[PDB]
């Protein structure tokens, strides 16, 4: 009988049930999207898009709905913070029901195409045997894809007949859904240009229509038909899997590095914005912009929005999680409540010291304070028998500006060390560690889990490409090698060409 | 060893599978509220 | 709600264990003659 790993091979020469099986997988996928959407709507907290956004609660499909213009709920709230909206039917609950109602209609279509498999359409009229003209099938399905690609960019993305897409400022502070005009210049190939994503689906959609029309009216060459086994349906699976894992590595990279298709207000910040201190530079640049215009130190740091200070902080780094640290980011450090303020450390001489920030590589990191040039002047010692830079002999104090503790100064060593321990993470925040019983151990954002999942899936599908690829080229020797081969087809210097009997 | 002549085959037709699956799925839906309590 | 923690695995095994018992007996009956 058939082994357990070959039970689904009964569909290779049964186009009806092959369609029925593909109808069932599509019914299963759409059913998950509706189920995963309903679960997220029941566990979501839309009451604070600043310090408790969706990417802090482990939302996976919610940002994908928000990316293409679905932002409101029937309950009356919006992921931007606006109340009093009316999203019509296409809300979060509507698109979830739309994927549930759809999932049932495929399940019924799968039953029909399964019972009535013996359709005359699936048979070659000249021979009366099952046959699918895959060459023309490719051009027909591509022609549809080119139409749906051009239509998605010409109407949905441009706002000509649709919502548009999610755009935002470079520092992810004022995100919204806006119609975008296509960018036909060289900057259209910038991954951080939303206009290029529009121009891509319009230009590639047109080329998809031309190519589809070509692959419909033009028959393949005789050699490439034979060399690629265009009669064997499994040659499509080999090449489709090959193109599939190609697209999986692309989305895995654009997610990790960041592009105009993965905003930071929908999946969090990226690893490299912490390495280059991308947020800290803008924060300080705005502090001197306030100080130069005559504002006090208390007023310069109070103008810093809490949303900007929440980005400049390591707990949101997607490279701080664990493989088995399950759950949302709020399960780790807690539910963010408020910005405590910007800490300023000074010794007894009165000069400002800066805490050395923790790199993403280190699970733990010591507390060391340098000065303006980097000379170590304070730390929390390990061995104290010969310590020279402890907080007491140096008189290290801490002052806050902006936030909750604005204007407050602490001088006792135990409490100054507490804030110095938090300064290695970035801007200090108050957390609610009790509502979810947070264990205080960092976790990664939806950006990391998507990157991890699709990068692993991409590598796994490489094996499928070469396996099903070798199944199509070595179909004759699938059950073994010719049982009357002879030590002459294999002998060296015999055949001039290896395996060519026409040259003795 | 000579085989045992007391051996018989077991059967469970399609209708008995539906009846059994219906019994334990309903007994579960009834008792689950008391398991969570 | 503060429900019992073992109630989940209690219901899950209460469904699964007798289910597979009937499934094994059925598939081994249709594979006969």
């Amino acid at each position: 009988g058939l082994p357990w790993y070959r039970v689904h091979t009964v569909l290779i020469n049964d186009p009806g049930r092959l369609i029925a099986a593909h109808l069932m997988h599509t019914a299963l996928v759409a059913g998950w999207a509706g189920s995963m959407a309903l679960y997220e709507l029941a566990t979501f907290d839309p009451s604070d898009p600043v310090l408790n956004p969706m990417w802090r609660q482990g939302m996976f499909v919610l940002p994908f709905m928000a990316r293409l213009g679905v932002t409101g709920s029937w309950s009356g709230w919006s992921i931007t913070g606006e109340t009093g909206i009316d999203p019509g039917f296409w809300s979060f609950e509507g698109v979830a029901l739309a994927h549930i109602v759809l999932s049932g209609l495929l399940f019924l279509a799968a039953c029909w195409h399964w019972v009535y498999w013996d359709l005359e359409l699936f048979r070659d009229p000249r021979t009366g045997e099952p046959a699918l003209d895959l060459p023309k099938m490719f051009g027909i399905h591509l022609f549809l894809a080119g139409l749906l690609c051009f239509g998605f960019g010409a109407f949905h993305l441009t706002g000509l007949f649709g919502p548009g897409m999610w755009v935002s400022d470079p520092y992810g502070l004022t995100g919204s859904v806006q119609p975008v005009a296509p960018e036909w210049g060289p900057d259209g190939f910038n991954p951080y240009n939303p206009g290029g994503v529009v121009a891509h689906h319009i230009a590639a959609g047109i080329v998809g229509i031309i190519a589809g029309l070509f692959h419909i009216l033009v028959r393949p060459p005789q050699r490439l038909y034979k060399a690629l086994r265009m009669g064997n349906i499994e040659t499509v699976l080999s090449s489709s899997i090959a193109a599939v894992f190609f697209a999986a590595f692309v989305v895995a990279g654009t997610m990790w590095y960041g592009s105009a298709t993965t905003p930071i207000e929908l999946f969090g910040p990226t690893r490299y914005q912490w390495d280059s201190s991308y947020f800290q530079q803008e924060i300080n640049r705005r502090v001197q912009a306030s100080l130069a215009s005559g504002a006090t130190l208390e007023e310069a740091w109070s103008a810093i929005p809490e949303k900007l200070a929440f980005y400049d902080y390591i707990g949101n780094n997607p490279a701080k999680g664990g493989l088995f640290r399950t759950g949302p980011m709020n399960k780790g450090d807690g539910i963010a409540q408020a910005w405590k303020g910007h800490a300023v450390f000074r010794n007894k001489e009165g000069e400002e010291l800066f805490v050395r920030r923790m790199p993403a590589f280190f699970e733990s990191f010591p507390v060391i304070l340098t000065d303006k040039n980097g000379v170590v002047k304070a730390d929390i010692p390990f061995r104290r028998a010969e310590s020279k830079y402890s907080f007491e002999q140096q008189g290290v104090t801490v002052s806050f500006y902006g936030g909750e503790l604005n204007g407050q100064t602490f001088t006792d060593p135990p409490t100054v060390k507490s804030y110095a321990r938090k300064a290695i993470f970035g801007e200090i925040f108050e957390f609610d560690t009790e509502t979810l019983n947070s264990d205080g151990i960092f976790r990664t954002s939806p950006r990391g889990w998507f990157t991890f999942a699709h990068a692993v899936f991409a590598l796994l599908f490489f094996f499928g490409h070469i396996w099903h690829g070798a199944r199509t080229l070595f179909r004759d020797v699938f059950s073994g090698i010719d049982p009357e081969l002879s030590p002459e087809q294999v002998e060296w210097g015999f055949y001039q060409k290896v395996g060519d009997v026409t040259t003795r | 060893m000579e085989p045992n002549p007391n051996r018989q085959p077991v059967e469970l037709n399609r209708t008995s599978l539906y009846l059994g699956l219906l019994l334990i799925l309903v007994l579960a839906l009834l008792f689950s509220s008391y398991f969570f309590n | 709600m503060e429900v019992n923690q073992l109630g989940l695995i209690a219901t899950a095994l209460f469904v699964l264990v007798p289910s597979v018992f009937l499934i094994i007996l059925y598939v081994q009956t249709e594979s006969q003659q």
């Binding site: - | 839906l29 | 429900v3 469904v15």
Partner: peptide
Amino acid sequence: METITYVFIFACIIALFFFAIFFREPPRIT
């Protein structure tokens, strides 16, 4: 976890209805 457990059992009983009707063992006469 409770709400998901109740609706999952409810969905199985409804799925069980679809097979017990359209995929029953045909009664035949002789």
